[PDB]
Amino acid sequence: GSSGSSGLNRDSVPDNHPTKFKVTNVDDEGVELGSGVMELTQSELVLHLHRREAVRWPYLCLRRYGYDSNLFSFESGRRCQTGQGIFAFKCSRAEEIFNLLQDLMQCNSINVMEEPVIITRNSHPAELDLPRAPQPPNALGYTVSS
């Protein structure tokens, strides 16, 4: 829970922004490959980088989201732009993003904003993911006669 809006223009995003957090995509070893900025908006997680193309990650797919000392990563399926694979990044306020992530996820923002037309619309059937399913019960044997 938080609030506070002001009509002041921003010059340069700080390294301790409440909504923004400068991250550094690292490798298994932890080395620094490229710099980027992570955004935590009710909408979804979006990474910013050089002229290169950007990326986005829907809070939905996000199956697991943890944190650690100057270490933050998330697991995504194969339906996401990037695709199947994990991505970790080195930051200074990883916890902050972790404590906020569960804040936007729980809110499950329901079309909070008027979104444009999406395939979701009723149309020809196709290979679309499937929902959850219940667990199958057990069976009962029987007694033997004389």
């Binding site: 995509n25 690292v26 490798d27 298994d28 490959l33 990326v55 809070y59 939905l60 797919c61 996000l62 199956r63 697991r64 989201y65 943890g66 944190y67 650690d68 270490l71 990563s73 697991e75 399926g77 990037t82 694979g85 994990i86 991505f87 970790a88 992530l101 569960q102 996820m105 729980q106 993911d129 499937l130 929902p131 959850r132």
Partner: peptide, 19 residues
């Protein structure tokens, strides 16, 4: 977007249980 083999973290608070 380096590809990792496994999650370097251990304490995670699973949120979405849907595929």
């Amino acid at each position: 977007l380096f590809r990792l083999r496994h999650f370097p973290c251990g304490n995670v608070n699973y949120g979405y249980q849907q595929q």
